[PDB]
A and B are shown apart, each in its own frame.
Chain A
Amino acid sequence: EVKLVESGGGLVQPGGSLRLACATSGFTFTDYYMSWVRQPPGKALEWLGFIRNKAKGYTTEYSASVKGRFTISRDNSQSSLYLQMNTLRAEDSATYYCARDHDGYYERFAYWGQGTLVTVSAAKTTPPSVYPLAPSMVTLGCLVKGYFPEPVTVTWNSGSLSSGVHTFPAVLQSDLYTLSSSVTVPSSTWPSETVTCNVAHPASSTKVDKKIVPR
């Protein structure tokens, strides 16, 4: 299985540097070019640069937008790729993706990681408060209030309740995010069975569960 996993992201203050990493597995890393691409929230994909394979002497190229400010390197001993980002600004906030690449003839060799979110902000890390929203079908929910940075991962019954879930995009106000998640279940399910929302916030190392109880 070809796999690419980005790390090193999260919240960073404006002004300095950050170096993202991409661990690769499942293919002969040195035979392939590797690219980085970013996507600001609600914006288009932006190619940043690449590093070529061993046949092409691992040479680099960059987009005109970041040439001279971001660089790319690879650790062929660890089959890993890096993106060094300098003089960060708020507007470098984005999801950063690592992608296996090659000559254009071999476009179909493409493979992308799931990405990692980088937030460039002066605001500080804050875990969420999680509050139950208790009322043929019935709708329950969980209010996830006052956290920073994105993201959180919201699940219902540890992930084993996924249908009928609407987890809304968070809204930023006064340096804090809030969202709610609803789940609509048969009335036969609840309250006879337990329904619990689970909220993970990696930035603050916090994982919280809230059972929904009638009231």
Chain B
Amino acid sequence: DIVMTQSPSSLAVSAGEKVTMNCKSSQSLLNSRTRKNYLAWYQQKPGQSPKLLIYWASTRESGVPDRFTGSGSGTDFALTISSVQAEDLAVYYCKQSYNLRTFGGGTKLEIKRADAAPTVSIFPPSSEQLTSGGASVVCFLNNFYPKDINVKWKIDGSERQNGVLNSWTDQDSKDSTYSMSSTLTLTKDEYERHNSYTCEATHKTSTSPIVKSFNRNEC
């Protein structure tokens, strides 16, 4: 089959700036009968189906913003977004339909913005889960940037490094921030061992951690 390669595989770009991404084919995509290149660009926003942006290498589909331009011919192609907007967060795919079909591997567009510290909220295990026998302590870190963050759990003064799982939302298509859940899973036995639970976020905007806590005895 025809092989398609895209570069770069990801990039971070700030709003208003230009992004170009490139696509190569293993063989010419130029149809000699119609004098079009059978190369298209698709945009796939997180959790959504892919949508056509550009066909015949350079023709925009109806309604596509004209910040999106494609060019190229034969075995080299490019898609440019002249001034990136927050809502352009997506994976962009090239696709040949000259002979069978092949997608490139995608270019994931992440939006760069200013560093932003999170809003932290903590939730002890609910009484309902405690009746079932288990105990998950949940911390939310809302609306921050960049994605990687130093989140720590402290239990009566000691760091708890096992049993923690972290998950992130897709970047917000409006403000380009992340949010993240931190879930500490404990047996009830071990939960009831200790008293002070703290979720601590150390973010690059400050050497002082952002802390939220509760005391079990106070519940």
Residues of A near any B CB (own CB < 8 A): 35, 37, 44-47, 50, 61, 63-64, 97, 101, 104-105, 107-108, 110, 112-115, 129, 131-135, 139, 141, 143, 145, 166-171, 173, 178-180, 182, 184, 215
State whether the Cβ of B44 lies closer than 8 Å to any Cβ in chain A: yes
Q: How far is the CA of A173 from the CA of B24 in the complex (A)?
A: 39
Within 8 Å by CB of A182, from B1, B56, B181, lies B181
| Count, chain B residues at interface, CB 8 A | 47
The answer to whether A145 and B1 have CB atoms under 8 Å apart is no
Within 8 Å by CB of B142, from A108, A145, A184, lies A184
The answer to whether A108 and B52 have CB atoms under 8 Å apart is yes
Stretch at the interface among B34-42, B71-79, B82-90, B196-204: B34-42
- Other CB < 8 Å A-B pairs besides A113-B49, A169-B168, 10 of them? A104-B36, A104-B98, A112-B51, A115-B49, A133-B138, A169-B169, A171-B165, A180-B183, A182-B121, A182-B142
Chain A residues in 8 Å Cβ range of B56: 107
CB distance from B185 to the nearest CB of A (A): 8
The answer to whether A179 and B167 have CB atoms under 8 Å apart is yes
Residue with the greatest number of chain B CB neighbours at <10 A, chosen from A97, A131, A134, A169: A131
The answer to whether A45 and B103 have CB atoms under 8 Å apart is yes
9 A-B interface contacts by CB (under 8 A) = A44-B106, A45-B44, A47-B100, A64-B1, A108-B61, A134-B126, A141-B140, A145-B136, A166-B169
Nearest opposing residue in chain A for B123, CB measure: A133
Q: How far is the CA of A49 from the CA of B151 in the complex (A)?
A: 45
Q: How far is the CA of A114 from the CA of B47 in the complex (A)?
A: 9
Chain A residues in 8 Å Cβ range of B173: none
B interface secondary structure, majority: strand
CB distance from B145 to the nearest CB of A (A): 15
Chain A residues in 8 Å Cβ range of B40: 107, 110
The answer to whether B50 and A143 have CB atoms under 8 Å apart is no
Q: Scoring B residues 113 to 145 as 1 if CB is less than 8 Å from chain A, else 0, what string do you get?
A: 000000101010011110010101010101000
Residues of B near any A CB (own CB < 8 A): 1, 31, 34, 36, 38, 40, 42, 44, 49-52, 55-56, 61, 93, 95, 97-98, 100-106, 119, 121, 123, 126-129, 132, 134, 136, 138, 140, 142, 165, 167-169, 179-181, 183
The answer to whether A168 and B181 have CB atoms under 8 Å apart is yes
Q: How far is the CA of A113 from the CA of B101 in the complex (A)?
A: 18
Within 8 Å by CB of A112, from B49, B121, B128, B142, lies B49
Nearest opposing residue in chain B for A39, CB measure: B44
Within 8 Å by CB of A168, from B34, B100, B103, B167, lies B167
Q: How far is the CA of A139 from the CA of B123 in the complex (A)?
A: 10
Residue with the greatest number of chain A CB neighbours at <10 A, chosen from B105, B119, B167: B167
Within 8 Å by CB of A129, from B98, B132, B167, B180, lies B132
